[PDB]
Assembly symmetry: C5
Homo-oligomer: 96 residues x 5
């Protein structure tokens, strides 16, 4: 049980690996601050072995964060559709 | 612990099997992007044997995703009432 | 770990028993579609022994579902105040 | 694992004790019916030893319930700021 | 399993240590009472080592609390951007 987190900037897929005999457990997703205040809804994706899964759609006004239980035992990528800001993903790494 | 997820397109029941001595744990539901300004509320169902259970009602305006804990040890189907878009279900498989 | 769920129709108490050395874990609650556009908040109860406990208040407009963690080791009843529709309760049974 | 719940009526702290080598796990909080009036936000507190902690703020309009994971290993008190109604807390007791 | 909680006043980082062979599990976040209207965004952070992670953005009107699952095995800091009030964080400590 080790705290884990990342900031995905401007949506470009961030490729991650839990490591041998580990899982990443993502528990918290948060929409970062806007520089402009042109806010469209922002889609969030986890890509695992190809399959690209929508996990949610955030907005500053209505959906600025999610409490989640996403469990990843293999290489994956996090990505989102906001070209001008960050989405924060956090949780913890687990053994076995 | 194996990441798992599916896209249910246009609501047609997707029949799934966790596998022998496995469970599917569904943790995240997300509503896909709409192509038009018709938004009807979209009902989501898990059908197990003779029981069709409503798990929720989504909309782009108010309810575009759910964080869930749905546990399936036997064959089931996922379905929804949106004839013109997708709902994404994700989570993980567990060994017994 | 066995998927479990029920439909409580028109609010009448549904009396249930987890069984010997079993638990019912209720993880998802969902408000059925309305035919009868009166609307009003719908209170949901779990009755265990002499205690009738409110678990929440649903509406089609604002609160059409809940994600819960309700654990029941002994006989109980589910009930709600909607006389003209259903509320769906689902989750799983656990041994030991 | 035993179902547990209480109704905290009006503004008075309810003092509770899990017992020796037990925990209370609070998983669901629900605001009781207001008998007409539109009411003010209601703050919820758990008091443990030297700490009175805000756990949230409920309203009939916007926040009538919470799904929680509050874990108490020693004597505590639940209280809230609604002088003329109830808040229901439920979950389960765990033996260590 | 020991109840844990803190009040972070006016945003100033609170530096905390779970202790040897312990984790802090943060389950509940709640926004304190405002005396006026707050116009500044209320952003919440957990800082661990070189990573400052946004966990969400609170408001009195729309997002006065979060139910979370944040796990910390290391020294960390909690902080937020509300200059004129408190955010309450609670949960429990776990051994081993």
């Amino acid at each position: 049980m080790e705290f884990w987190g990342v900031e995905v900037k401007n949506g470009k897929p961030l490729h991650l690996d839990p490591g041998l005999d580990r899982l990443v457990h993502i528990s918290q997703v948060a929409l970062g601050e806007s520089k402009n205040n042109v806010t469209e809804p922002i889609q969030l994706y986890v890509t695992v072995g190809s399959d690209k899964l929508l996990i949610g759609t955030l907005s500053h006004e209505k959906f600025p964060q999610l409490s989640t239980e996403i469990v990843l035992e293999r290489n994956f990528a996090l990505s989102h559709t906001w070209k001008n800001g960050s989405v924060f993903f956090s949780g913890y790494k687990v053994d076995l």
